[PDB]
């Protein structure tokens, strides 16, 4: 079967209180 | 020293890791570095968020959807710590 590849990333950063 | 998870109502202690959404059906897991700050670093790179199915997988997990052209694809979450997935005729 022929192949597709993907990719999703997310990163991030925050602070909380 | 805590992290905090205002959406969830959740607090975390330095080093301890979470599951959190993100913009509605996106899932990242985030980990607590405090840094006197509540810091958190938050990341996908564990998971499949696919915009096609607005639907979040684990890595192994398969699920199938269209290409362009008609044809169906069977897909599967395998990381790759870059939030890769594949998918195959």
Redesign the interface.
């Given at each position: 079967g022929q192949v597709t590849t993907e990719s999703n990333l997310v990163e991030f950063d925050e602070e909380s209180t | 020293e805590?992290?905090?998870?205002?959406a969830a109502g959740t607090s975390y202690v330095v080093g301890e890791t979470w599951e959190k959404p993100?913009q509605g059906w996106?899932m990242?897991d985030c980990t607590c570095?405090g840094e006197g700050?509540?810091?958190?670093?938050?990341?996908?790179?564990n998971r499949?968020?696919?915009?096609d199915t607005r639907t979040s997988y684990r890595i192994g997990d398969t699920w199938s959807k269209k290409?362009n052209r008609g044809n169906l694809?069977?897909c599967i979450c395998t990381g790759?710590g870059?939030?890769?997935?594949?998918?195959?005729?």
């Open positions: - | 805590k992290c905090f998870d205002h993100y996106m990242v570095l700050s509540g810091r958190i670093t938050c990341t996908s790179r499949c968020n696919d915009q290409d694809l069977q790759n870059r939030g890769e997935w594949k998918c195959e005729r």
